Amino acid sequence: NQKDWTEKLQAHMASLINLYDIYLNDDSNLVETWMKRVSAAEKCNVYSEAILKIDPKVGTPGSFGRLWCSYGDLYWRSAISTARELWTQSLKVPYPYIEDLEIYLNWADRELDKEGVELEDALHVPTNPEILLEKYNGHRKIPAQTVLFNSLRWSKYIDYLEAYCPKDANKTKMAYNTVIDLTPAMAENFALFLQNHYEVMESFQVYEKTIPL
Amino acid sequence: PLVHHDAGEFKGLQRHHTSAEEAQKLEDGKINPFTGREFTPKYVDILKIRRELPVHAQRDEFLKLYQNNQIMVFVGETGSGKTTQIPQFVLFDEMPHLENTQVACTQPRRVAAMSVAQRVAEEMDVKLGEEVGYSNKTSNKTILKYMTDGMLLREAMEDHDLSRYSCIILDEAHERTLATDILMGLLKQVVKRRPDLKIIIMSATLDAEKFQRYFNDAPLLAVPYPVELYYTPEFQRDYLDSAIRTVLQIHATEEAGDILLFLTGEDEIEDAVRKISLEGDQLVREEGCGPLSVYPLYGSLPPHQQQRIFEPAPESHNGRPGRKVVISTNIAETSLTIDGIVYVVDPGFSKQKVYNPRIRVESLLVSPISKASAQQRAGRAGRTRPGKCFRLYTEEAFQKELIEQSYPEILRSNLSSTVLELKKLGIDDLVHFDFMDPPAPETMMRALEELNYLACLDDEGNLTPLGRLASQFPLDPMLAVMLIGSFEFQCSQEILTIVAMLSVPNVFIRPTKDKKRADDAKNIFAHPDGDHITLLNVYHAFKSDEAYEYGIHKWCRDHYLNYRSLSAADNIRSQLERLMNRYNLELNTTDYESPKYFDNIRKALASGFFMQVAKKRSGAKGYITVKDNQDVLIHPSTVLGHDAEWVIYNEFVLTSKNYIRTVTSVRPEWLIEIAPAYYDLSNFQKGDVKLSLERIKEKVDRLNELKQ
RNA sequence: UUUUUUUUU
């Protein structure tokens, strides 16, 4: 047991050899998987965070631990689905916080961390905007996504614009033309908008502007 | 003693001379011939229904054979009313209540016996568990007794001549199960001792020649929609792609009706399911094909998920024929009627058991099916409506390439148990013993060797108290010996639980698309150095008050666990506990606070599974088995994340590689202590990786003894 | 990365 303790202290001083020492010693096992934690990977950090969330009476402790886990896993991320799940989960923590009445401000903070992250991130902005509109402040969030796209005033950001202009409709005309400065389906769609508003002749003009291209 | 009606309306006939007319005259009566009850309208309707069954039209003839022959064979179409009507015919000819005897009908399944007991109980207008019953609902008034072959085998083990029965019926003898064959072999001698016994052999399909020739030229009674057969002109290079493409083809072109596809394993089946689902959806979307519903079907599924195949075909909004595709193993190959199935797709492959006498081990291998099996698979259709069967092989292959009829299980399976049971029957010279089909002497000798090391058979060849005790249990001899020796390590309850958990299919649920959360949920119950210990934790958590306060089934559906497997395990554990209490085995356990807890459990495990031990290659990759010296690896579903160089395993499985399933770390010292007979250095081959450090452990032991 | 079958209210 003492030599195993030396194997443990050596593990603290530290790969698999410590685990072999653990087998030589063979709650300590869960402690050992925890040691593996002490050493897709970030996704595993998320899945374990999910099972821990299932295990979450100090749920707040497991959640804050998930936050510090975000602080550690962020180093591993040097991003899309990692950052995306990271945002969806953080906002989910502020969502369970919202259920706890514990949340939108901290959600704005984690979303600010998403701003600190460095198109899936645009999905994150789309998410903060999504709950933000689900929150009962529709225009206020649109002003923010607009703050981002205006911040882009690049070409890659335009796919996010199609991600944004698609719901920015619910005036929008110039917002749409900004795309023309920088996709036929998009064109026919927009002309269909004006047709729905029955601008008619203006709509025909759009087809003039498409075909010159 | 059996309670019965004294009768009197039965008198007027010489024994064994009952005609059909008299029986029918008793049937149409307002009063029951065997009980004092009056007949219900339900009985009238059911009688009207069953009187039109094909087996009834031959009743007279059946009687005329059964009266003049001691042993007879019976073959009829599927669902003609064999299992239900034949024993009643027997009841009408015999005098079971007058001569104070029972009549036994044997089913190879529990559910079979139970269900048919229900149906027949409703047919004879008796309450289930009274005069007609299954075993157990059998009381002292029970005349018609449905039972598994194992139960009849037990009653045969307690009473050699089976004096309680005057007529014994074995249905579905085409499966040739262990208990069935043993029972036939016994009955062949019982008929020599007592001529008052009659034996009936029933099956829907059979190679009746073997049965007739075995029972000394026994008589055979054979009682009488088109299914079209399609063969491929050429050979199909990849049977899987051929299967998928052909199923999609039947979906796109052929007439209305459901499709039944046979495949190999659950992995292959899942792959085929998701592929056929995807391309099927694409077919509906782009080529305007009808809606398609694919359902998987294999043994490891819960009974509900198995029942899911009988769901109606998908509704159609577009007008295109919506249909259902049932992807199954050979579980639906024999005796099963699905209403919607019209088409049957057969690649001609299955997974069968292969045994190597040199290694003395059994594994599973993909093999070509048999002619009989093909006729069965093709016979699944053409019941509700005319069927069409697409076989993915040439007719020339059917005539030549395909085996005549599936090799018997006894000639394949490890006996290791068969020998023990034969010895319990009282057979001394098994080599000289009269089988219908004698097994391989190599396998026999190795089995006797295993039982010799397990101390079930002494050096002389007779049964030890350990063998005589372990024979009564429904377990594999190793599991048995382990369970018996358990209470000496003061942990018999835990070992009992572990055995029960090993006797049930895989508990853990692992979704294809959600592996992480399932693996975490398993890691919660996971225990270092032991899969068995982990299983014990799982059952101990399932039987916990907390899990009952949550929602048990909900709790199982929250921790990624199979409720069916867990409840089945609880049941098995109850049975084994009852048996332990019957043969007087102490239920003993130790505190978790005691550090010798896990060690006791491990030791008790080694007591029965010392022959199945693996050692990791010193300074290399992979493991190697002590027995027969085979290179092996640890199964991916094993908890042990660290390299324990000495392990005890439960299952040997062949798939992508030679894998070892369900393990637990052990000390070689314990192994030497428990089974010195098998672990003497003299037994094993020259200097190999195992022996080299085993001898080091020996040097260690001898130094320990030297210092004292 | 790979559970064919079965194992008494």
Swiss-Prot record, chain A:
Transmembrane segments: none annotated. It comes from the Eukaryota. HAT repeats lie at residues 46-77, 79-99, 131-163. GO terms for biological process: generation of catalytic spliceosome for first transesterification step; mRNA splicing, via spliceosome. The keyword Repeat applies. Coiled coil: none annotated. GO terms for cellular component: cytosol; nucleus; post-mRNA release spliceosomal complex; Prp19 complex; U2-type catalytic step 1 spliceosome; U2-type catalytic step 2 spliceosome; U2-type post-mRNA release spliceosomal complex; U2-type prespliceosome. Keywords: mRNA processing, mRNA splicing, Nucleus, Repeat, Spliceosome. Present with 2170 molecules/cell in log phase SD medium. Belongs to the NTC complex (or PRP19-associated complex), composed of at least CEF1, CLF1, ISY1, NTC20, SNT309, SYF1, SYF2, and PRP19. This is Pre-mRNA-splicing factor SYF1. It comes from Saccharomyces cerevisiae (strain ATCC 204508 / S288c). The chain holds residues 370 to 614 of 859 of the full protein.
From Swiss-Prot, chain B:
One of its GO terms (cellular component) is 90S preribosome. Its EC number is 3.6.4.13. GO terms for biological process: maturation of 5.8S rRNA from tricistronic rRNA transcript (SSU-rRNA, 5.8S rRNA, LSU-rRNA); maturation of LSU-rRNA from tricistronic rRNA transcript (SSU-rRNA, 5.8S rRNA, LSU-rRNA); maturation of SSU-rRNA; maturation of SSU-rRNA from tricistronic rRNA transcript (SSU-rRNA, 5.8S rRNA, LSU-rRNA); ribosomal large subunit biogenesis; rRNA processing; spliceosomal complex disassembly. Changing residue 348 to E: In PRP43-1; temperature-sensitive. One of its GO terms (molecular function) is helicase activity. Residues 246-426 form the Helicase C-terminal domain. Gene3D superfamilies: 1.20.120.1080, P-loop containing nucleotide triphosphate hydrolases. Residues 63-224 form the Helicase ATP-binding domain. Residues 18-30 have a biased composition (Basic and acidic residues). It catalyses: ATP + H2O = ADP + phosphate + H(+). Keywords: ATP-binding, Helicase, Hydrolase, mRNA processing, mRNA splicing, Nucleotide-binding, Nucleus, Phosphoprotein. Its main location: nucleus. It is found in: Nucleus. ATP binds at residues 76-83. A motif (DEAH box) lies at residues 171-174. It holds the Pfam family OB_NTP_bind. Belongs to the DEAD box helicase family. DEAH subfamily. DDX15/PRP43 sub-subfamily. This is Pre-mRNA-splicing factor ATP-dependent RNA helicase PRP43. The gene is PRP43.
